[PDB]
């Protein structure tokens, strides 16, 4: 148990101090960052989390608790939280506040594919739809836990599968209310982004290393899950 | 424990989802193949499971429940779904068509060879019959997870037998009535498919990498199965 | 991790079936070979069990029920049968009807030696009489498992010491009634061999890699359990 | 396996002996030390834990138990204590005597940053400000156990993130009341050295491999947390 | 899990039988050896236990059960027992007839000393008094491991500490009654060398690779716990 017997501890023997990492959108939008704070009582309502902020220089950048929902690493009570980047009005790299505006019910499936590579090679392990045995699942085991994870903390996913280009594969998010859909894929974005760096494997969300609409009925710009969804709901109903 | 310390997690805590994974026998070889999605509520009538698809040109072909077992490496309430190929007219590769309408009480233990050699070399990984000690057993490990795997399933496996020759095994299929010799000598047939996959050890089924009555009305080789057990039921019907 | 978080499954979660190991004894009578298949209720009355078989080429040869005893490596309510070969009269590898009809209240005790070496060397691995520290006792391990195994099968295993010669240990079948008494060592010189088969260890019983008699009053030449015992016996207790 | 099976035993059943690991300062550099001690009856007062000493030769040095928490490899009942030097008055080098005379409600929120090196080689292992997955985050699993043992033990740690030069970390000593504040940041920096000696690992805190105030009117070269806290304190809770 | 998997199995769920080691002193007073019987009902009373005896050319020597206590390499009700070798007139290496007869309340506390090496190149592994951290303590586990299974046993030893000389400690054995004081220490001496034996390392007790007198009335040339103990007592109570 080099490393192992610890990270995971019981929490309500010792104390009652609940951990609840602060995750936002960074970089040129594919990075997507976090860090970790305590709290002192278990609650899982958005309008009770005390806000926070960080510096963006490394620019006084305010954060507001958005989703609160569990995390894979951690169990019991412990708590991720979706925040958005505000400038010191929503900074410009949130690409939030539009969305939050157009949609204040379209159900959203987005589609997401995502490749995995070696992370000490950076190229993918090693008839193809599905297909099991040598050569074919390199990695399922961690399709099995990223699959779970996001089960067990509370993203809306409805399946996944592989296709032809080696170790790539897809998963789906089905019945997400619309900006729920913007939070739902990025959660489920970077719980994988962790569950990989666990190994030697790095997933890579991009092409080269669909979007349902089911509303209740109707009564009325590259790769971003809100900007497509925020387009898309524009000129249909709602 | 890198990656393992997921994939066994719980779900009776955090969602009521069950995952139910659906299988279809693949091409020209015997390569059944299946790809992951979700459900609702844990249920085990094949009757209220939806009928879905998938697309063939990776075309359009369609799937129905009719075999929910429960899963060997996924446990809790999480279900294997036994499908086979229909294009909406049964799909010449299906040939289950014509075995249900002839069988809709003829039992079968039809016998079945699983020899198993390593993965990169593709040779065995080390007075033969059932041979206990060095140079006899070249991993039971593997074989003794698949039997007990298939006894927790829900597949009605009786027995299984060492070979003189170093590699082939065999496992008795029990007493299967008529029709379910067509599941519950494919998915548990499938099961082995993944368990040598956890392994640097691969199946090879063919003969080169017996036929069975048990009839109540007392009148009385794996790769192609269905056209075995309904041309025999045929001479020798109800 | 990988291949070693099967093998260990519930049995009455799922099926209330029982599974069986029939042991029979090889040609030359130091190879004990057996085979697994499965039972539906679990009994461990040895009348109740069914008579089974084998092919004696790899020739039928007949087995019934001799011993039931539980399981080591299985657990649960796994149970090892030992069992004698019959011709379809007694077969004369057997050598076990003349001591069944010779028994037909001794208490015995037999002692049994055994060398470990490497696997592909045939040395033992790494003064010496019951030794502790550097360059004493080598594979203690494989001993402290093979000791409690025995104790939790059914074998009345009482006691095991170390020699001088390097890699030699020595274990006491204990105090056990008539002809039973053999049987059980055979189980005992069974178990051993699955055991060091986890190690990757060649067990070496031969001479170049006791008998105990205690009765109540009158009853109310190469290494044999059977022909050793039924020799000491004809002499004064029958 | 490899020791790693002990040291975890349990201690409700056997004997309820206690143990107490006595922590005082070192000499010239930070390097907290300790040994063990037992005890009989298990109690979290320090006002009742028996003084003890050591030889400041390798001179007598007597210590007394100021600090009783919990412990992070020993669980249960094992109980870590902090405790300051003195000379058979105050030894110079303990430079608690002054803040513990001048404290007798200041908050106290001191920062700490802690640079991973690898063990032979002095070099780090392995947009980087509290980045994610590869390239960004190297042994977090060592971060993460430290996070958990420090809320685990009785340190009321608050936060904890990265930064952009490679290979450090930051960690919120939190809001506790008087020189006790101080005292917690030793503890836990203690706790520190303990985990990273598991993965061979060399922590530096020196600057070439801030303070918060509150009070109860508010709310809530040296690295010293007794100097700094002290000197602060003096020109404002004097 | 291979060959780890067994040696923790439960004892009362199949059968109350337990073991017990009996332990003797080796020829050359530094060797402490051991083999192993088996009792049927857990008696902890010294009496009550069978008189056994060995082999001394490896010469009948008999051996008495003196000390019982339980067992850290098995737990559940197997027991350990020191012994002291009988000839059938005690045998001049046993040395334990005369402080019996000396003895026949002073509670002594004995010091040892204690060096690591590695098993091969019998060097040691890997400012240095109770050292923290990298270059300072080598093998906390072994030390950690043996702490508490001797607190487990009934060894109530006191505290262990670090010291200077690379890879060597030191460990206290305090609050003992009679001579039993004595046989305490080599039994605590006995289980250090099992859990070396795990480890791969080699303990040297040599000089080169303190004792405490408290009565009930107070105050009103080898390392022998023996002789040391009844030289020691012939001045001052017997």
């Avoid at 903390?153 to 619309?178: D, K, L, R």
């Avoid at 913007?182 to 080269?208: H, N």
């Amino acid at each position: 148990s080099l490393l192992s017997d610890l990270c995971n501890l019981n929490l309500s023997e010792s104390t009652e101090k609940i951990i609840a990492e602060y995750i936002w959108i960074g970089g040129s939008g594919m990075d997507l960052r976090s860090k970790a704070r305590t709290l002192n009582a278990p609650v899982s309502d958005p309008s009770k989390l005390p806000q926070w902020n960080y510096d963006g220089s490394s620019s006084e950048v305010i954060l507001y608790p958005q989703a609160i929902y569990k995390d894979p690493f951690r169990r019991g009570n412990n708590i991720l939280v979706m925040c958005d980047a505000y400038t010191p009005e929503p900074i410009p790299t949130n690409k939030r506040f539009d969305a939050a505006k157009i949609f204040s019910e379209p159900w959203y499936g987005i589609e997401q594919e995502y490749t995995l590579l070696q992370k000490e090679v950076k190229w993918p392990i090693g008839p193809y739809y599905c297909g099991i045995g040598a050569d074919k699942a390199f990695g399922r085991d961690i399709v099995d836990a990223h699959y779970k994870a996001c089960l067990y903390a509370g993203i809306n996913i409805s399946g996944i599968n592989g296709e032809v280009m080696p170790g790539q594969w897809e998963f789906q998010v089905g019945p997400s209310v619309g900006i729920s859909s913007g939070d739902q894929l990025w959660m489920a974005r970077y719980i994988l982004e962790r569950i990989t760096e666990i190994a030697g494997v790095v997933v890579s969300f991009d092409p080269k290393p669909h979007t349902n609409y089911s509303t209740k009925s109707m009564r009325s710009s590259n790769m971003d899950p809100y900007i497509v969804t925020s387009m898309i709901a524009n000129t249909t109903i709602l």
